[PDB]
Design a protein around this nucleic acid. Structure first.
Ligand SMILES: COc1cc([C@@H]2c3cc4c(cc3[C@@H](O[C@@H]3O[C@@H]5CO[C@@H](C)O[C@H]5[C@H](O)[C@H]3O)[C@H]3COC(=O)[C@H]23)OCO4)cc(OC)c1O
Ligand SMILES: COc1cc([C@@H]2c3cc4c(cc3[C@@H](O[C@@H]3O[C@@H]5CO[C@@H](C)O[C@H]5[C@H](O)[C@H]3O)[C@H]3COC(=O)[C@H]23)OCO4)cc(OC)c1O
Ligand SMILES: [Mg+2]
Ligand SMILES: [Mg+2]
Ligand SMILES: [Mg+2]
Ligand SMILES: [Mg+2]
Ligand SMILES: [Mg+2]
Ligand SMILES: [Mg+2]
Lengths: 724, 724
DNA sequence: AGCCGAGC
DNA sequence: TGCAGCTCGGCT
DNA sequence: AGCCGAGC
DNA sequence: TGCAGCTCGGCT
């Protein structure tokens, strides 16, 4: 009736107005899918309107924000809803243009969140409408299987997994994952609406417990409630896993009604947990799942030259089975690369291009399609390649992907800090000096006491003092030049240059009466320098009061919510950063033991293989073995009867979960019969034998010291080049 | 005063209004660079406003379009310009808010076109203003070099190339290309405006010859002029190339004034030529530079699975040195993939997703980030891999890229047609049947006369008759069902279904008096079916008049401007499609000769290498050669004394522009001393020898017939699967 | 007076 | 090409 | 009462 | 994430 992107129903606003249905979809792509499915007949009774992502939570939202929201204003106009109107009587429902609203989103956790926000909107503004079976949802499959011309659909991952357990020949079926509504074709869309019984679920009001559930999820007043709520979920799911029990799921059979209580505690709770899993980092590598996928990809690619952020994002997506919008990966990549004051002490990705500055706090970054990046030379030193063999890599989309966590040589979570916002919890950890952390590691390794650590930011000329535990004061730098002039040499951490000029200095220049007379900017892209001119009286006043206080060069930093995932996926709340450092130390020391154990096995096999290859060559030259014009099968019998071992590297690798293999012996070129290459082979076997023996007489701590030494050397070199 | 994206000057609209300067920039990214450059103390006198791409040509534009143009209305409001006002007197110039307009665009050909469009705007509306030195331009470098701490800038590619000629050690310097204003940093931006003298060029009126130059470039009445204008440029530049002479350029030294005549004939002409080069396809492969880069990339990648169009575009850009917006590449990729009626007879890229239909003529395509594509199975058959070794690959950005043209087995330009719009010329070539083209090729190869070819479109049920040469009539299909009902089974080529419904049937239903009573749609995604209800009198009337005429199911097709680039980069205008077919035949036949010659060399070398390797093994087994524990130098002497040839493949590779190399002999594994592998080696030697002998007894025409045969077979298989 | 396509 | 909405929790 | 970041 | 302006020449 005057709104774009709207495919309004034809029978909307007549006698049969209550017999119409409005389909709210997850985006415009979803709108197209719904439209194709609903045709050709049914345009009269069914309407479609796309929602541009997640909508507004209006339960504690201000009056200004709610009225100035375009999304909900469109919905109100289309449906014909009226603000603060009671719909208890069956006559008030006749006023609306549509009878029922069917929410059709993705079959992912985010889709569930969208449904919840819509429900929250209706429940808060019109509680009467919710008790009249006004809301429903259109569900679409997420996994499909077919062997011949028969087809089966699943509507949840637990359902699909349970099917593979019951069905023996599950590998004889095609497997098609549905990332979203966009995956489904127009033809498949028609088949969906043809079987409306299966894909239609009606929301049912059962009592006050529903209101309690809805309020639980979307009230800012009930945060502690959601904490216990999710704590129970995490613990129970953990126990189900320990007892070897499958997760419960919905939409297994055809269901008519769905309680709001059940919806919140069986579907929406899945989102809130996944939100915490993707927003709150792990203590081990300080990475989130999204970030870790990027790092895993860059490690797998091993690019020697720069790569577009946009291009890299796509690579990460396909190689790490990333099932979200690529824009998020791009923003993550940019964030990981930033290295201005207040961001990262040790950026894992190189910011090659305009990734933002301290001027606008990174917001001045260029388009991801116009900037380049690659691994920092410190990345594979912080996360040594040798440790990859002791990690547990996840499986998704029929391929191996990122591990549950990487195991860096120093607690990375303390280096670039940690910021994240989920449901129930949120994480906030300040940055710390790398060299200082390395030192504390060495002290803990020497059985000494770890020194207390103050938050330290790279290239920050200011100071950071501690008052109460986990409560700090960050101060910039100011200096007196004369009776009328002062110099501001540093702003406090995360206090950006442009914002400071607009929010602090410009008010001081104008109007409360003016304080400063004039100011000049001498900023570089990495440093801050303000020169301020004042009267002699004004400066004398500010001097006794406190220059830092007057010019707002002090910011407070309270970090009590240091919430992280431990090495087993449990949400721990760490009290001090030394707790994090200690727990990390235990785990890291253990995995150095594990690395040595693995390396012993590998180097052992490799030495054994070299032993066989050397013996084979020498016996051939001595004439103890004839292979010229000899058949393969006969020659194999010869080797076995002469006691030659099967491929040790192959045999050892297979032990990490066709007859004997002697290919590695004959795969050797004719070169290794020459004198120069024979000596080289005998040299390599002795050298490799030596490496194994050298490793045996080294403690895990010794190996750790090696990595730390190698890291520090390059760290100095890198930061030196930075200063230059 | 009410316009967004505007950083208006502070002294605008005062006494010093004529002392102000307005900077019109190429986009918003350019605005940021200007803003950064004028800082930190330079402001008040300088204003910045971004132009959203190329603006409107107002020389022959309608009154409605000019007044309803947002771009020019903003400039007029900001500067304070008045329509049809004389500015000869020095008092009228005080009325404006700005004194001078400085145009700051990229240093590319497109930027030049923008400057030209601005000049055209001013010259046409206010000729008096042009004679007062009102317009100027801000120029930025395109290439920078630096060896130590000294830096040099170039403002044109010919200047940089001339510099590399004059400077011996040009490789000891860093080379930084500037794709656009976005490439320059904030620091470099500041350095540009700091040296205002160098980067400021004032436009100067010299006489009536300037008006003639401006009119030449932007008047629709002077098209034939631009043909000769560009004809002279192409011929002169061609001769300069043949004589080894450098191109002329501007901005070598610091210049104060620049005449409009020189600007048109030395800068804008570069654009118009580049426009023709990127819009008009080559006769050889029927591809444009943009399209060819996509195909070259897809050939290099050899993807076995689908790829996002967005993702692929980025891949093409970096791998083929593409220096334009990736969106152009995305639209190009989509265009190459389309396969509905009226588009491509043989799409080189598979349209996996919504690439558009005949319903809305391809405009209904989905987002490039949500659709996939890959090479058609016919692609590497049309463009045989064996021909890649005879092509001339271009060099750009220090890497190899697409060739000047590919050499397909059949004239691809005639298959999917050819559409392009440049300056002076424009291309329009209809589609032709593949099999008919294959046949005429075979006829020309058999020494017969080529048969005349009518335009043929794939899956087109209609008819195409020829009236005058290069003038055709395309007719749809209509049938009489009864006295009141007719069936429209096909619309003429490129007459879209939705457009036909709105522009033909709907007027017939309403209001001139109504003709039809009712109509129904029975369309699929690939076919058209209209059923129309009329009175017996109306149908009888339309029947005698002509149903095709009445329902406008006939469209005319005149193709006189069949303009293409020949095999040497000269713009030729072909009269008939048989001329294109004939010229192609000569070139293709020549290159089949070239292919055989190259293959003879390669296969010869490969056979020689296999001969030596086979002989070496047999002599070793027979005991004619001892290599066990023998020194390298001694063993080399043995081989040379036994007449063993040096590495033939290596020798042959090097011929395509210390001492004998026998590595290939000893590089062979010990396996090849065994019976099974010895027989394997001897078979390959015989097989390669056979392949060489087989090639020898084949004419170039014989090889061509082979490719055509292999192509036709797969063509049948593909098109069969399509119909199913 | 609008379509066709590679560009800003 | 640049442009815009919202979530979720803790803190100034 | 607005920032921080991975998501729609 | 989807959205919008214009060029250039030949033809209906
Ligand atoms: C009507 O088009 C649709 C829009 C959306 C939203 C959206 C919605 C907006 C809005 C902006 C956005 C936008 O996020 C902006 O995008 C930027 C993308 O690049 C990075 C660098 O930075 C991001 C911004 O932080 C974010 O502000 C979208 C990107 O991916 C989405 O999911 C976003 O401003 C006004 O309302 C979803 C849909 O269907 C699910 C749609 O059909
Ligand atoms: C935002 O501000 C700027 C805009 C531009 C233009 C542009 C200008 C427009 C306009 C749209 C566009 C747009 O093209 C649209 O994009 C689409 C994107 O890809 C495919 C899918 O299809 C393309 C459309 O055919 C085209 O309609 C731009 C894409 O790349 C450009 O060069 C385009 O509508 C109104 O005016 C240049 C600048 O600096 C040089 C700017 O700062
Ligand atoms: Mg989704
Ligand atoms: Mg950070
Ligand atoms: Mg450009
Ligand atoms: Mg075409
Ligand atoms: Mg909030
Ligand atoms: Mg025109």
């Amino acid at each position: 009736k005057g709104i774009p992107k709207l495919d309004d129903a034809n029978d909307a606003g007549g006698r049969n107005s209550t017999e119409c249905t409005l389909i709210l979809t997850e985006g415009d792509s979803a709108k197209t899918l719904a439209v194709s499915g609903l045709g050709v007949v049914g345009r009269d009774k069914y309407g479609v309107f796309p929602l541009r992502g997640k909508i507004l939570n209006v339960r504690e939202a201000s009056h200004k924000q709610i009225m100035e929201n375009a999304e909900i204003n469109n919905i109100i106009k289309i449906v014909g809803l009226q603000y603060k109107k009671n719909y208890e009587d069956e006559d008030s429902l006749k006023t609306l243009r549509y009878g029922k609203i069917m929410i059709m989103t993705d079959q992912d956790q985010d889709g569930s969140h969208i449904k919840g926000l819509l429900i929250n909107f209706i429940h808060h503004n019109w509680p009467s409408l919710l008790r009249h079976r006004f809301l429903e949802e259109f569900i679409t499959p997420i996994v499909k299987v077919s062997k011949n011309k028969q087809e089966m659909a699943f509507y949840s991952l637990p359902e699909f997994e349970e099917w593979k357990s019951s069905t023996p020949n599950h590998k004889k079926w095609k497997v098609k994952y549905y990332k979203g509504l966009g995956t489904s074709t127009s033809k498949e869309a028609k088949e969906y609406f043809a079987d409306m019984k299966r894909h239609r679920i009606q929301f049912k009001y059962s009592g006050p417990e529903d209101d309690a559930a809805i309020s639980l999820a979307f009230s800012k007043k009930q945060i502690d409630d959601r904490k216990e709520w999710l704590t129970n979920f995490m613990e129970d799911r953990r126990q189900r896993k320990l007892l070897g029990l499958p997760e419960d799921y919905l939409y297994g059979q055809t269901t008519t009604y769905l309680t709001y209580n059940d919806f919140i505690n069986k579907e929406l709770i899945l989102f809130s947990n996944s939100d915490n899993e993707r927003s709150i980092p792990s203590m081990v590598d300080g990475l989130k799942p999204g970030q870790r996928k990027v790092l895993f990809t860059c490690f797998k690619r091993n690019d020697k030259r720069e790569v577009k952020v946009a291009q890299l994002a796509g690579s990460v997506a396909e190689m790490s089975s990333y099932h979200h919008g690529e824009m998020s990966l791009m923003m993550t990549i940019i964030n990981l690369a930033q290295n201005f004051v207040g961001s990262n002490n040790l950026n894992l990705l190189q910011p090659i291009g305009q990734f933002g500055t301290r001027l606008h706090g990174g917001k001045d970054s260029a388009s991801p399609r116009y900037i380049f990046t690659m691994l920092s030379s410190l990345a594979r030193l912080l996360f040594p390649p040798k440790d990859d063999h002791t990690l547990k890599f996840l499986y998704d989309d029929n391929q191996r992907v990122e591990p549950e966590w990487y195991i860096p040589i120093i607690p990375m979570v303390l280096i670039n800090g940690a910021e994240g916002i989920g449901t129930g919890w949120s994480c906030k950890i300040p940055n710390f000096d790398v060299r200082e952390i390395v030192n504390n590691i060495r002290r803990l390794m020497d059985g000494e006491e770890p020194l207390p650590m103050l938050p330290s930011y790279k290239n920050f000329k200011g100071t950071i003092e501690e008052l109460a535990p986990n409560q700090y004061v960050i101060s910039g730098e100011v200096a007196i030049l004369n009776s009328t002039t002062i110099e501001i040499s540093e702003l406090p951490v995360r206090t950006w240059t442009q914002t400071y000029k607009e929010q602090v200095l410009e008010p001081m220049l104008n109007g409360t009466p003016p304080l400063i007379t004039d100011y000049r900017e001498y900023h570089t892209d990495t440093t801050v320098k303000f020169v301020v001119k004042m009267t002699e009286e004004k400066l004398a006043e500010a001097e006794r009061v406190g220059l830092h206080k007057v010019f707002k060069l002090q910011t407070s930093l309270t970090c009590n919510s240091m919430v992280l995932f431990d090495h087993v996926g449990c949400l721990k709340k760490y009290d001090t950063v030394l707790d994090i450092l200690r727990d990390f130390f235990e785990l890291r020391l253990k995995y150095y033991g594990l690395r040595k154990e693995w390396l012993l096995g590998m180097l052992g096999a490799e030495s054994a293989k070299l032993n066989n290859q050397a013996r084979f060559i020498l016996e051939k030259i001595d004439g103890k073995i004839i292979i010229e014009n000899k058949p393969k099968k006969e020659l194999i019998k010869v080797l076995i009867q002469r006691g030659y071992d099967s491929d040790p590297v192959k045999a050892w690798k297979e032990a990490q979960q066709s007859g004997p293999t002697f290919n590695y012996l004959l795969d050797m070129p004719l070169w290794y019969l020459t004198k120069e290459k024979k000596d080289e082979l005998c040299r390599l076997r002795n050298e490799k034998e030596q490496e194994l023996d050298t490793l045996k007489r080294k403690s895990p701590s010794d190996l750790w010291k090696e990595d730390l030494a190698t890291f520090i050397e390059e760290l100095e070199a890198v930061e030196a080049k930075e200063k230059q």
